[PDB]
Ligand binder design. Sequence first.
Ligand SMILES: OC[C@@]1(c2ccccc2)CCN(Cc2ccccc2)C1
Ligand SMILES: OC[C@@]1(c2ccccc2)CCN(Cc2ccccc2)C1
Ligand code: NA
Ligand code: NA
Ligand code: NA
Lengths: 154, 148
Amino acid sequence: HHHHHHTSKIEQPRWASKDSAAGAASTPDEKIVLEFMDALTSNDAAKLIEYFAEDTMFQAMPLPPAYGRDAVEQTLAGLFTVMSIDAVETFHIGSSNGLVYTERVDVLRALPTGKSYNLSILGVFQLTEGKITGWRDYFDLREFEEAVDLPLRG
Amino acid sequence: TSKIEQPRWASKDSAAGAASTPDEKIVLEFMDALTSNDAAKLIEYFAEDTMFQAMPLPPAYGRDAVEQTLAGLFTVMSIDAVETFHIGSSNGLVYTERVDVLRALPTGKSYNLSILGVFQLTEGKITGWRDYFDLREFEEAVDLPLRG
Ligand SMILES: OC[C@@]1(c2ccccc2)CCN(Cc2ccccc2)C1
Ligand SMILES: OC[C@@]1(c2ccccc2)CCN(Cc2ccccc2)C1
Ligand code: NA
Ligand code: NA
Ligand code: NA
């Protein structure tokens, strides 16, 4: 898809489905999640938190989880203090039992160093009545930190 | 090993960890087979046109490379247990949110590693398997580097 950020470029993985529909939404829950992926490039925790239920949680799995909407917003705002989401490409999206799975590459740029990295992520979303009750992203933190020279554990 | 606790964030939908399709059933059977630590048993599940990647490490393409890459992991690690909290699927992809209890043979240490994986199935055979997780957290937990 077009990322409207000319300094970024995402290559198609050899293993990624070529089908137009592979990363296209087939259900209402998948559509809301792709809408949320599109919103991530705002880098605005106060806009993004509107997608979440009060009883919710967030975890970038190499780092500790945040429970409840206030903590999720605070945690997302903290990440946006040091990183910009420049682009998101979702190669595969699927869903079952109220969970949505996204296999993606996020182009992330470390604001303190100016360096960016194309990060392989597999994430899961739990939705209750169209609102996010859980979001967990799985990926390797070290390879990101080393590419952008930004340790994130503390 | 001791019982693997359900995470606080796990779904309480009683079907979340159950297979709903024949492909999901195959993937759960494959998860059961992992504790064999036996690449020759595991490769029976794979198509000739296939791939495997533990995402922090380089991929293996084709059934022969996949078997040899899994056998190589088994030279240093035992899979002592696998607990699949969530399984779902769409469009021939099966997703598994899991904890794998992995033990490093050189150190004897074990860690309950959080993993999200995707499997591609064609005609009941695995044509792709990619696991996403934090490699450093595992390496530091069991005192076993896997990426120099
Ligand atoms: O794009 C959404 C994520 C994100 C990135 C940047 C700012 C907010 C949110 C959530 C988890 N994802 C992985 C990640 C977390 C922490 C550090 C590095 C990677 C990326
Ligand atoms: O349990 C199946 C996996 C596995 C583990 C151990 C031996 C063979 C296979 C497949 C890759 N998975 C990710 C992984 C790779 C290397 C180190 C830690 C995690 C785990
Ligand atoms: Na689709
Ligand atoms: Na299920
Ligand atoms: Na589905």
